[PDB]
Structure formats: C-alpha cells, structure tokens
Design an enzyme around this catalytic site. Structure first.
Site, PDB file in Angstrom:
ATOM      1  N   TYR A  97       4.447  -7.209  -2.849  1.00  0.00           N
ATOM      2  CA  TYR A  97       3.559  -8.373  -2.591  1.00  0.00           C
ATOM      3  C   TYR A  97       2.330  -8.333  -3.558  1.00  0.00           C
ATOM      4  CZ  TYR A  97       6.560  -8.848   1.644  1.00  0.00           C
ATOM      5  OH  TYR A  97       7.662  -8.890   2.492  1.00  0.00           O
ATOM      6  N   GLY A 135       0.488  -2.903   8.861  1.00  0.00           N
ATOM      7  CA  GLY A 135      -0.368  -3.993   8.412  1.00  0.00           C
ATOM      8  C   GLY A 135      -0.018  -5.337   9.058  1.00  0.00           C
ATOM      9  N   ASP A 156       1.387   8.057   2.734  1.00  0.00           N
ATOM     10  CA  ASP A 156       0.038   7.868   2.149  1.00  0.00           C
ATOM     11  C   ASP A 156       0.041   7.556   0.642  1.00  0.00           C
ATOM     12  OD1 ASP A 156      -2.767   7.858   1.657  1.00  0.00           O
ATOM     13  OD2 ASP A 156      -3.168   9.898   2.238  1.00  0.00           O
ATOM     14  N   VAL A 169       1.346  -8.077   7.522  1.00  0.00           N
ATOM     15  CA  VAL A 169       2.739  -8.424   7.132  1.00  0.00           C
ATOM     16  C   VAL A 169       3.776  -7.362   7.594  1.00  0.00           C
ATOM     17  CG1 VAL A 169       4.204  -8.904   5.150  1.00  0.00           C
ATOM     18  CG2 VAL A 169       1.867  -9.748   5.260  1.00  0.00           C
ATOM     19  N   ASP A 182      -2.997 -14.314  -5.467  1.00  0.00           N
ATOM     20  CA  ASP A 182      -3.436 -15.373  -6.322  1.00  0.00           C
ATOM     21  C   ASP A 182      -4.571 -14.868  -7.168  1.00  0.00           C
ATOM     22  OD1 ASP A 182      -4.909 -16.025  -3.498  1.00  0.00           O
ATOM     23  OD2 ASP A 182      -6.215 -16.755  -5.110  1.00  0.00           O
ATOM     24  N   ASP A 229       3.921   4.488   7.664  1.00  0.00           N
ATOM     25  CA  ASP A 229       2.513   4.216   7.309  1.00  0.00           C
ATOM     26  C   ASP A 229       1.719   5.537   6.879  1.00  0.00           C
ATOM     27  OD1 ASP A 229       1.581   5.693   9.606  1.00  0.00           O
ATOM     28  OD2 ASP A 229       1.632   3.969  10.900  1.00  0.00           O
ATOM     29  N   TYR A 280      -9.477  -6.237  -7.536  1.00  0.00           N
ATOM     30  CA  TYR A 280      -8.313  -6.392  -6.678  1.00  0.00           C
ATOM     31  C   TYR A 280      -7.258  -7.060  -7.540  1.00  0.00           C
ATOM     32  CZ  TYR A 280      -5.409  -8.676  -2.840  1.00  0.00           C
ATOM     33  OH  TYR A 280      -4.394  -9.134  -1.977  1.00  0.00           O
ATOM     34  N   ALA A 335      -0.936  -1.565   1.031  1.00  0.00           N
ATOM     35  CA  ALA A 335      -1.809  -1.906  -0.099  1.00  0.00           C
ATOM     36  C   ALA A 335      -3.312  -1.814   0.203  1.00  0.00           C
ATOM     37  CB  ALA A 335      -1.489  -3.282  -0.553  1.00  0.00           C
ATOM     38  N   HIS A 336      -4.132  -1.666  -0.829  1.00  0.00           N
ATOM     39  CA  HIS A 336      -5.618  -1.704  -0.702  1.00  0.00           C
ATOM     40  C   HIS A 336      -5.922  -3.192  -0.764  1.00  0.00           C
ATOM     41  CE1 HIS A 336      -9.895  -1.443  -2.062  1.00  0.00           C
ATOM     42  NE2 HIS A 336      -9.894  -0.124  -2.103  1.00  0.00           N
TER      43      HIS A 336
HETATM   44  N1  LIG Z   1      -5.051 -10.347   3.399  1.00  0.00           N
HETATM   45  C1  LIG Z   1      -4.869 -11.222   2.369  1.00  0.00           C
HETATM   46  O1  LIG Z   1      -5.668 -12.172   2.280  1.00  0.00           O
HETATM   47  C2  LIG Z   1      -3.791 -11.035   1.316  1.00  0.00           C
HETATM   48  C3  LIG Z   1      -2.739 -10.111   1.217  1.00  0.00           C
HETATM   49  N2  LIG Z   1      -1.757 -10.019   0.121  1.00  0.00           N
HETATM   50  C4  LIG Z   1      -0.634  -9.068  -0.099  1.00  0.00           C
HETATM   51  O2  LIG Z   1       0.160  -8.960   0.993  1.00  0.00           O
HETATM   52  C5  LIG Z   1       0.427  -7.580   1.137  1.00  0.00           C
HETATM   53  C6  LIG Z   1      -0.157  -7.127   2.466  1.00  0.00           C
HETATM   54  O3  LIG Z   1      -1.340  -7.790   2.971  1.00  0.00           O
HETATM   55  P1  LIG Z   1      -1.688  -7.583   4.519  1.00  0.00           P
HETATM   56  O4  LIG Z   1      -0.496  -7.019   5.275  1.00  0.00           O
HETATM   57  O5  LIG Z   1      -2.165  -8.965   4.893  1.00  0.00           O
HETATM   58  O6  LIG Z   1      -2.947  -6.624   4.417  1.00  0.00           O
HETATM   59  P2  LIG Z   1      -3.138  -5.404   5.355  1.00  0.00           P
HETATM   60  O7  LIG Z   1      -4.446  -4.667   5.060  1.00  0.00           O
HETATM   61  O8  LIG Z   1      -2.921  -5.810   6.757  1.00  0.00           O
HETATM   62  O9  LIG Z   1      -1.991  -4.366   4.906  1.00  0.00           O
HETATM   63  C7  LIG Z   1      -1.983  -3.378   3.892  1.00  0.00           C
HETATM   64  C8  LIG Z   1      -1.534  -1.988   4.402  1.00  0.00           C
HETATM   65  O10 LIG Z   1      -1.907  -0.914   3.509  1.00  0.00           O
HETATM   66  C9  LIG Z   1      -2.174   0.182   4.430  1.00  0.00           C
HETATM   67  N3  LIG Z   1      -2.911   1.182   3.804  1.00  0.00           N
HETATM   68  C10 LIG Z   1      -4.273   1.303   3.647  1.00  0.00           C
HETATM   69  N4  LIG Z   1      -4.520   2.424   2.979  1.00  0.00           N
HETATM   70  C11 LIG Z   1      -3.345   2.984   2.722  1.00  0.00           C
HETATM   71  C12 LIG Z   1      -3.028   4.157   2.058  1.00  0.00           C
HETATM   72  N5  LIG Z   1      -3.966   5.011   1.515  1.00  0.00           N
HETATM   73  N6  LIG Z   1      -1.686   4.491   1.929  1.00  0.00           N
HETATM   74  C13 LIG Z   1      -0.720   3.668   2.466  1.00  0.00           C
HETATM   75  N7  LIG Z   1      -1.035   2.503   3.132  1.00  0.00           N
HETATM   76  C14 LIG Z   1      -2.331   2.201   3.234  1.00  0.00           C
HETATM   77  C15 LIG Z   1      -3.055  -0.516   5.356  1.00  0.00           C
HETATM   78  O11 LIG Z   1      -3.523   0.125   6.546  1.00  0.00           O
HETATM   79  P3  LIG Z   1      -5.066   0.187   7.130  1.00  0.00           P
HETATM   80  O12 LIG Z   1      -5.719  -1.180   6.918  1.00  0.00           O
HETATM   81  O13 LIG Z   1      -4.913   0.506   8.609  1.00  0.00           O
HETATM   82  O14 LIG Z   1      -5.691   1.302   6.301  1.00  0.00           O
HETATM   83  C16 LIG Z   1      -2.113  -1.590   5.758  1.00  0.00           C
HETATM   84  O15 LIG Z   1      -1.198  -0.914   6.584  1.00  0.00           O
HETATM   85  C17 LIG Z   1      -0.162  -6.896  -0.088  1.00  0.00           C
HETATM   86  O16 LIG Z   1       0.494  -7.129  -1.291  1.00  0.00           O
HETATM   87  C18 LIG Z   1      -1.316  -7.765  -0.174  1.00  0.00           C
HETATM   88  O17 LIG Z   1      -2.108  -7.662  -1.293  1.00  0.00           O
HETATM   89  C19 LIG Z   1      -2.093 -10.974  -0.772  1.00  0.00           C
HETATM   90  C20 LIG Z   1      -3.016 -11.944  -0.932  1.00  0.00           C
HETATM   91  C21 LIG Z   1      -4.005 -12.066   0.220  1.00  0.00           C
END
Ligand SMILES: NC(=O)C1=CN([C@@H]2O[C@H](COP(=O)(O)OP(=O)(O)OC[C@H]3O[C@@H](n4cnc5c(N)ncnc54)[C@H](OP(=O)(O)O)[C@@H]3O)[C@@H](O)[C@H]2O)C=CC1
Ligand SMILES: NC(=O)C1=CN([C@@H]2O[C@H](COP(=O)(O)OP(=O)(O)OC[C@H]3O[C@@H](n4cnc5c(N)ncnc54)[C@H](OP(=O)(O)O)[C@@H]3O)[C@@H](O)[C@H]2O)C=CC1
Ligand SMILES: [Mg+2]
Lengths: 298, 298
Positions: free
Chosen positions: B102, B10, B39, B12, B105, B30, B128, B63-64
């Site tokens: 993580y 992701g 997964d 972060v 807000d 991942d 969410y 995360a979703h």
């Molecule tokens: N983006 C934003 O605005 C915000 C993010 N956060 C928090 O920060 C953290 C990460 O955000 P960020 O890194 O920016 O978001 P990302 O979508 O970049 O990261 C989340 C990760 O979850 C992975 N993922 C998706 N589906 C699955 C699954 N079924 N099993 C395991 N992993 C999965 C995603 O991959 P893929 O996308 O390739 O499926 C990605 O690797 C979380 O707590 C998030 O809520 C908080 C507030 C705002």
C-alpha cells in the site's frame, strides 16, 4: 453489472452490503424500502422489483428466521421461505439472472456423528426446515442459474446474538446451565458474505458450478463449549463476570416448540474445491466478533 | 495456498484478517508477534519470517503512518516504509511469491483540478511521501510479481478516525473551524481489504496484471464537506451536539510540520478494468461506519 440484494438489514445482509459493493453496482433493499418493494409478504410485489430493476445477480438474504414462532405461524413462514422465493426465481429466469439464496441444516433430521452431505436425503424436523426446503426445491425447479448455500448457527457482532445474550446472563447471574448435546459449527455473517462475493465471480465465468452447497465454518462444537469460549475470552479481556458455576445439560431439559436437531454437522468439501476457497475454523470468527464487541470506544 | 499478512492490527489490516481468510490459509502478524518476527524495524528479521514461512502471497499492511512525526524521525520512517519493503521484496522473489503493498497520494505534489494517474510524474512534498515512494520503487525493482495500491484518507470504525475526533469536538464544543481547500476521496478499510482479496484471485490466474494501481472510493470532497456529513448524519441519528456554527478555513491558517497536499484526487480507471471491479462513492463507506458507530449496544 448490477446486483440486487434483499434482506439488507439482516445479520448476513448487513455484511453483504459491504462485500457485494465492489463486485458490481449494488442496489440494496428491505421491508421498509419506500421507493422499491422489498416486503416478502407480497411475492408479486418483490417479483415486480426484479422485473422493474433487471439485475444480473439477485442475492436473497431476506427470510423468516424465528424458528419457534414459525410453528404457530406456519403459513406466514411458507410465504417468506417458499412462496416469494419461487416468485423471485421465475422472474429471474425470465432474464437469465443468477439467484443466490440461503438455506439451513434444519432440512436434515438428527442422527449424530456423521456430517450431512449435499447428496444426502432430507427429512425436515420442524416447520422452518419444512418451509425452507420448499423454497430451495422451488428455486432448483424454476431457475437453473442458482447458488444455494445451506448454513448453520449464523451470528454477527451488530445486533443480538448467542454470545451476547449469554454474556448478559453471565454479568447478571451466578450459575448458568446450557445444552451439551446439539452439535454444530457457528458461522459468521462475515464469512458467509465474503464467500458469497467470490462465488458470484466464479459463477459468472463458469456456469457449471451452479447448484447446492454446504457452507459453514470448519470444526465442530456444542452450545456449551461455545459459551465456555465466550466466557473464557471475556475474562481474558478483563470483563468481570458474576458467573462462577458453568453446567452442561440435555436437550430434553429445555422446552422448545420446534424440534431442534441433534446433529447439525455439515460436510463442506464440495464448496471448497468447486470455488477454490478456504473455510476457517469457527473459533476465529467468534474471537474476532467478541474482540470488536469488547473494544467499545466512542 | 498460504497467505502472509503483516500489520494485522492496523486499520486496513484488521479488515484484511476478515477478507483474506477464505482466499487462502492465512497467517497474520504484527510487532508483538511473539512466535514470529513482525517488527519492521528489523528488516532481516521480517525477511527471515518470509523465508521461514514460505508464503504464496505476502500482503503488507504494516507501515509508519505518523505523517508529521516522520519529519522529526525521517530515518525511522525510511526503515519502515522503504528498507523493510525492499528486504521483503527480495526474499519474496527468491520463491516467486506475490507482494501486495500500500502506498499514498503523498507521492504527488499538489496542483488542483486534475486527478493524478499512474503514468504521471511523481514529486513527493514531505518525508512520508518520500519514504513511501522509495518503498514502491524498491518493490518494483526487486520483485516483478507485485500489486501496489496507492490510496488516500483511509478510515475504519474500529479505533481512532477523523469522523470520531470531529464528533468528540462537536459534543464538547460550540463553533468549529475546519479546512476547505485540501480536496480528496475518503477510503474505507473495508473497501481496501475487500478489493485486495479479489485482486489477489485475479492476479494468481493472470500474471499480466502485476503493477501499480490507484485505489480509492469514487467521488471527491474536502475535510469540511466531510465533517458536514458526519454532523448531518449524527443529527439524523439523534445524537445531540453542542456544535452550532460550522466554519470553513484555508490550509495556511493551520500549522503542520509536514507539507499536506492540496490535490489528493486519484484517477482509478486502471484498477477498474484491469480487475473488473466497482469502486463506490465515498459517502456509502462513511455512512456505513457512522451507523456501526452509533448503533452501540452491549
Ligand atoms: N491513514 C491514512 O490516511 C493512509 C494510509 N495509507 C496506506 O495504507 C497502509 C495502511 O494504513 P493504515 O492501516 O490506515 O494505517 P495504520 O497505522 O492503521 O497501520 C499501519 C501498521 O503499521 C504497524 N506498525 C507500526 N510500527 C510498526 C513497526 N515498527 N513494525 C511493524 N508494524 C508497525 C502499525 O501499528 P501501531 O500503529 O499500533 O504501531 C499498524 O499496525 C499503508 O500503506 C499506508 O501508508 C495510505 C494513505 C493514507
Ligand atoms: N440465524 C440463523 O441461525 C440461521 C440463518 N440461516 C439463513 O441465512 C439467511 C439469513 O439469516 P440471518 O441474516 O442470520 O437472519 P436475519 O433474521 O438476520 O435475516 C433475515 C431478514 O429477513 C427480513 N425480513 C423479515 N421479515 C421480512 C419480510 N416480511 N419481508 C422481507 N424481509 C423480511 C428480516 O428483517 P427483521 O428481522 O428486521 O424483520 C431480516 O432482514 C437465511 O437463509 C437464513 O435462513 C440459516 C441457518 C441458521
Ligand atoms: Mg466489519
């Protein structure tokens, strides 16, 4: 708590703007810093900014790093790698600030197999090594609150680097020829900056750790093995290459003004227990930067 | 000391592969991790890897994060933002590992002017926020060695982000229209990862810091002000833009399945004194990533 950083726009310095940013209030400069002097040519000039800014920690990533040109301009290298370091050291000692500074494997000769430790004797082969040694000796003598990190084969994904210049050859050319006898460990700017941030936080609570450290990614490889991996990953990424015949060579075959060392292997056990940090295999770092380089979307 | 990281690819997570690398021996996974289950759909599946790997610190960046789709798929979001977190928490408590996680807000409503603290009451506006809250409550209840970092408007230079999608519009289009009433602080993945690395090192020596923290770049701005700065820097960089008429708008004017909040301002004083770290103004982070984006050489 305030941090002063010189050499902001270098490979390591660009990553230190990132890593030092939460450690403390950061002030970052370079040669063209207009409102503060950062030109390491004028040592009383840089020194006056240390005195005019009053920082708790000074981190020096500015340096003369053109190894060959250095032989033709030895006195300009001395100014940059020794004169301004001494100047900065002395001024730091006026306020008991820490000084963090970077050095090199070129402080050592070349005598294969064995990786060089901190207590080992130093015999610089070329001017770069000579001037940089002078700087580390000037620092050690003028300021007891220092952290010297000797490193090697340092790269970054922003800007020019080895992998890049080789790929560029590999696209344009058909049979390449590269060295197989200078041994070492490619070290990422990402790692150097990240480790520096944590060493500063330890140093602050435990003054006893002041001193000189070897700091390089783990493992050992050669420029050839290195390029093989850059080609291997390029292919796996689906880059096409006009390269097909990869040949290894001796050092002698290639001219170079400055004497390059044969044995750039550095033992880093000291930094590891002293700061409680891991130093990862060089390959991780390189694959990561290759992957940021190849995933070019706008 | 071993670190387990989920969500490696992701925003972060990509930066945490960098930052956690010297903190300890890192194992990064991942969804498509073939030799280890990553997964988050299969919670007993992720949990079995925690038990099969035995890590000292677990860092969960998977995360979703599709805020809108979430409303149409509420149960799939629950699984990812709450079920697998609880599962992972419980398994971590079996070996007294730390869990770093993580949040958001979107756990808060929307009631302008005032920035939300940790002791404040929570009233999630959308799914969410609802699911993510559940996860942070599951974690707090199932594992006393946790670090929860609520963050906001998180971006990175690798991949898709706000600045990008807006620039892309600004090249293709002539008059743009973007929101001026949702207030907040854009937070870089670089900062979140870097702070996490240092908080882990403190946590390990001082268990007392376990708990919940607000963690976002300093300052405050709106999506409009944000885009103005992306355009301003683009121009200053010599990018040309077909954009000429930049107009601010209400939230109401734009549809969106999930209720977006008005007041995403978070007070972060807690994290600052508890970890002794600085949190820099959002603008530094964004200028840095813009400059890595615009300096595209191959
Ligand atoms: N983006 C934003 O605005 C915000 C993010 N956060 C928090 O920060 C953290 C990460 O955000 P960020 O890194 O920016 O978001 P990302 O979508 O970049 O990261 C989340 C990760 O979850 C992975 N993922 C998706 N589906 C699955 C699954 N079924 N099993 C395991 N992993 C999965 C995603 O991959 P893929 O996308 O390739 O499926 C990605 O690797 C979380 O707590 C998030 O809520 C908080 C507030 C705002
Ligand atoms: N590259 C390598 O292989 C190695 C590097 N190191 C050490 O790591 C540290 C930094 O290396 P790295 O960041 O990779 O090298 P860089 O050349 O990227 O960085 C050095 C910095 O010095 C700046 N600089 C040049 N001239 C002046 C000047 N007159 N006054 C002030 N600053 C100036 C350079 O800018 P500009 O180039 O734009 O003039 C650059 O910003 C140094 O100690 C270096 O010796 C050690 C061993 C190997
Ligand atoms: Mg980076």
């Amino acid at each position: 708590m305030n941090i002063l950083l010189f050499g902001k726009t270098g490979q390591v310095g660009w990553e230190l703007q990132r890593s030092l940013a939460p450690v403390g209030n950061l002030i970052a400069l370079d040669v063209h810093s207009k409102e503060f002097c950062g030109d390491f040519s004028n040592p009383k000039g840089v020194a006056e900014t240390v005195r005019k800014l009053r920082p708790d920690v000074i981190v020096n990533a500015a340096a003369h790093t053109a190894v060959d040109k250095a032989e033709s301009e030895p006195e300009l290298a001395q100014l940059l790698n020794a004169t301004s370091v001494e100047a900065i050291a002395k001024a730091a000692n006026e306020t008991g600030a820490w000084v963090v500074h970077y050095s090199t494997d070129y402080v050592f000769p070349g005598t294969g197999d064995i990786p060089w430790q901190e207590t080992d004797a130093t015999s610089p082969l070329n001017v770069y090594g000579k001037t940089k040694l002078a700087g580390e000796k000037a620092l050690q003598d003028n300021c007891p609150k220092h952290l010297i990190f000797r490193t090697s084969w340092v790269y970054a994904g922003k800007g020019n680097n080895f992998a890049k210049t080789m790929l560029r050859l590999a696209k344009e050319r058909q049979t390449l020829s590269v060295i197989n006898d200078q041994y070492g460990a490619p070290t990422g700017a990402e790692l150097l900056a990240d480790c520096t941030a944590h060493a500063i936080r330890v140093a602050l609570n435990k003054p006893e750790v002041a001193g000189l450290y070897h700091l390089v990614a783990g493992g050992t490889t050669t420029w050839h093995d290195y390029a093989a991996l850059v080609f291997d990953e390029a292919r796996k990424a689906g880059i096409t290459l006009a390269l097909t015949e990869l040949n290894a060579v001796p050092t002698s075959a290639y001219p170079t003004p400055a004497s390059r060392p044969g044995n750039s292997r550095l033992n880093t056990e000291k930094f590891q227990r002293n700061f409680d940090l891991i130093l990862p295999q060089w390959e991780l770092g390189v694959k990561r930067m290759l992957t940021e380089m190849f995933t070019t979307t706008t």
